[PDB]
Amino acid sequence: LCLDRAADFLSEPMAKEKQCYLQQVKQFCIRVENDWHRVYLVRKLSSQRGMEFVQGLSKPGRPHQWVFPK
């Protein structure tokens, strides 16, 4: 549910609360060392906004690259 909330936040085309939440979620995905969390985040973001937006995030110079596995 947390990853779903984060994906809905990142799907928005963000005032001191969603930013802190996404930062905490990034720290969590970095710390827990689990690929499945990032996988589910990617899958939800895709189901929300097509795989084209996901692949666009996959490009260099993007602020949402941690969503992808290593």
């Binding site: 895709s46 189901s47 929300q48 906004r49 097509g50 795989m51």
Partner: protein, 171 residues
């Protein structure tokens, strides 16, 4: 199929459909309360004495569009798909002749292409909500509908014929 002829016009001869009824219209239901001979509604006291169906494209800002409501006995999903096909044909026509679609669209607007594109995006969102599938799967559902309309084998000058065409395309 002949059911594709109206759309064809809207896609290649929209000028012929400037006075046509589209499936994307509320279809005023009136055609309780009473009306005085002066034109004042009352259920006299106020005055002391005892169709509205538009044409063309009468949907306003796509933003305020939230929920799809059908008043002609059709499922909301099929109604939405029909509206989406209609919007695609209207976008094709605009690209072909922008002024025809500007006259069809009520209230008029500057850029018909972006108008219909936003309508299509809102339609896809509503369809994904009312079907649960992903965005890609919703687009694929539209592609499936188009495939079926192709494989299977007028000008909507009348509201009744418009509703009949809606029923046939839904079937």
């Amino acid at each position: 199929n002949e059911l594709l002829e109206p759309l064809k016009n809207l896609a290649f001869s929209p000028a012929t459909m400037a006075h046509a009824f589209l499936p994307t219209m509320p279809e005023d239901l009136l055609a309780h309360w009473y009306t005085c001979p002066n034109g004042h509604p009352c259920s006299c006291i106020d005055c002391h004495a005892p169709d509205r169906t538009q044409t063309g494209h009468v949907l306003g800002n796509p933003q305020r569009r939230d929920v799809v409501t059908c008043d002609r006995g059709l499922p909301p999903v099929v109604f939405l798909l029909i509206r989406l096909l209609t919007h695609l044909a209207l976008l094709l026509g605009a690209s072909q002749s922008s002024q025809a679609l500007i006259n069809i669209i009520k209230p008029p607007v500057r850029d018909p292409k972006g108008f219909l594109q936003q309508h299509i995006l809102k339609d896809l969102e509503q369809l994904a909500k009312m079907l649960g599938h992903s965005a890609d799967e919703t687009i694929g559902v539209v592609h499936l509908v188009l495939r079926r309309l192709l494989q299977e084998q007028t000008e909507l000058s009348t509201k009744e014929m418009r509703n009949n065409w809606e029923k046939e395309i839904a079937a």
